[PDB]
């Protein structure tokens, strides 16, 4: 009953620390570039 709580708030603290402490990289840049690119071709395909 204690270990379940410690594991649960441990894993919550570690995903929190991965959100705060991970610096951005090139593949995260490619994800935004494909989101704007794919949304671009989708809007151009609806308006064409």
């Amino acid at each position: 009953e204690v270990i379940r709580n410690l594991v649960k708030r441990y894993v919550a603290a570690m995903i929190r620390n991965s959100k705060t402490n991970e610096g951005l990289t090139e593949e995260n840049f490619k994800e935004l570039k494909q989101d704007i690119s794919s949304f671009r071709y989708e809007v151009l395909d609806l308006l064409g």
């Binding site: 649960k8 919550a12 995903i15």
Partner: protein, 74 residues
């Protein structure tokens, strides 16, 4: 978690204002999905709409009877 509860918690974190609102209007008509449904790591739909800074899904949830408890700190 149900598959429709995961469909609602995957409707949020994507930024939908249509399928989230349709799920919150189906929640009133039928008791199909509880709005206060957690992820496997805590994480209610309100907290998902807080980590992604979207105020429209926050107003859309807070217009409904979502459990707001201890979510202002997040």
């Amino acid at each position: 978690l149900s598959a429709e509860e995961k469909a609602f918690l995957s409707a949020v974190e994507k930024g939908d204002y249509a399928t989230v609102k349709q799920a919150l209007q189906e929640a009133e008509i039928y008791y199909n999905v509880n709005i206060n449904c957690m992820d496997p790591l805590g994480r209610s739909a309100l907290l998902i709409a807080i980590e992604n800074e979207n105020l429209e899904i926050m107003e859309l949830l807070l217009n409904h009877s979502v459990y707001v408890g201890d979510a202002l700190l997040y």
